[PDB]
PDB file of N, CA and C and ligand atoms in Angstrom:
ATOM      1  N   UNK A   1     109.856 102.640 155.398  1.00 30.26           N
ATOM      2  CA  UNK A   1     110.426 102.434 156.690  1.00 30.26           C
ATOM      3  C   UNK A   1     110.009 101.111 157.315  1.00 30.26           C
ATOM      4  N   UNK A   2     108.876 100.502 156.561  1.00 29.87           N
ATOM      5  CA  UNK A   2     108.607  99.436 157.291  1.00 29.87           C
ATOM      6  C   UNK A   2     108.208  98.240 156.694  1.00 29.87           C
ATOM      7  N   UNK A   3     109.270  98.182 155.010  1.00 30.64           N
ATOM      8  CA  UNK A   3     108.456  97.847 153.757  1.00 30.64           C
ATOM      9  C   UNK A   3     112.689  97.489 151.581  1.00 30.64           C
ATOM     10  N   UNK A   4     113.430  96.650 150.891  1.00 33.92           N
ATOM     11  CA  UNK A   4     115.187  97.144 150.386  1.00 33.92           C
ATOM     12  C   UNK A   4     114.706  95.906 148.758  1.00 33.92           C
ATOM     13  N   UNK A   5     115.856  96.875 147.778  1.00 35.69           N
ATOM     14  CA  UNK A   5     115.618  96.500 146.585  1.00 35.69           C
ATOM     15  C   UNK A   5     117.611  96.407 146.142  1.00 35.69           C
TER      16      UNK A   5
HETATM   17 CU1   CU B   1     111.193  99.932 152.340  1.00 37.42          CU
HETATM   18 NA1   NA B   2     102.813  98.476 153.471  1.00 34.70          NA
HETATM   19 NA1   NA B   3     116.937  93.106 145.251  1.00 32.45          NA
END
């Protein structure tokens, strides 16, 4: 949440 691939 605080960390896209
Ligand atoms: Cu993330
Ligand atoms: Na982290
Ligand atoms: Na990517």
């Amino acid at each position: 949440a605080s960390x896209a691939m």
